[PDB]
Amino acid sequence: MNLKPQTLMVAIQCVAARTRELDAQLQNDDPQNAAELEQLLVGYDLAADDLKNAYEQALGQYSGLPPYDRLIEEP
């Protein structure tokens, strides 16, 4: 099903934010399964890209949505 566009916004934001958080751990905290985590983050980025194409589509169907680049901005 199409997710609602608010759902896409949230998922994009959460994916971006977990990706920053786990990338920062990967580099600053020497975590226990670093190698597995690095591959997980590739999977997160691919998902991010799929969410981004879906949100570009939603931008053509709805009004009042924030632009993609604002959603993934570092706060």
């Binding site: 053509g60 169907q61 009004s63 009042g64 949505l65 959603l71 706060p75």
Partner: protein, 153 residues
């Protein structure tokens, strides 16, 4: 499961006094008050652009045409009070409140983190913002009327 004529359950809307221009304390325990009314069951329509703070998703979203269609979000209420601990109180929609003709109220899922069942007040047909806001205002008024009917037994 949607309700279309009368609500079958008491529902509670969290009130953050910071979100309003007027003082809305009057509405927590209201005497008969169809008068201008505070937009208590209005959903957010946009995410304000405050730099640094990540965007707040809008509760409901219009199509290109400017029409708000059903099942695209709406106004959140719950089936018990005090779900949102940081609110200033709950505006009450009693079991038996008349639902404005072009709105409906949808039962969504039980939320485990909040231990309450969420519901959404929503358009029943596509409508522009003004019409929706109008009906939500009448929904507030109906709820107040129904608070007095309940009080007089």
């Amino acid at each position: 499961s949607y309700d279309y004529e009368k609500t079958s359950l008491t529902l509670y809307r969290a009130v953050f006094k910071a979100n309003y221009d007027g003082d809305v304390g009057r509405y927590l325990h209201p005497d008969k008050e169809l008068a201008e009314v505070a937009p208590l069951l209005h959903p957010t329509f946009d995410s304000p652009n405050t730099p640094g703070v990540p965007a707040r998703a809008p509760d409901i979203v219009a199509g290109r045409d400017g029409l708000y269609a059903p099942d695209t979000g709406g106004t959140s209420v719950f089936d018990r009070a005090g779900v949102l601990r940081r609110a200033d109180g709950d505006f009450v929609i009693p079991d038996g409140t008349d639902i404005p003709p072009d709105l409906k109220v949808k039962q969504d899922s039980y939320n485990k983190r909040l231990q309450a069942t969420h519901y959404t007040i929503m358009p029943a047909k596509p409508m522009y913002r003004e019409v929706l806001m109008g009906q939500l205002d009448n929904f507030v008024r109906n709820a107040i009327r129904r608070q007095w009917e309940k009080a007089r037994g």
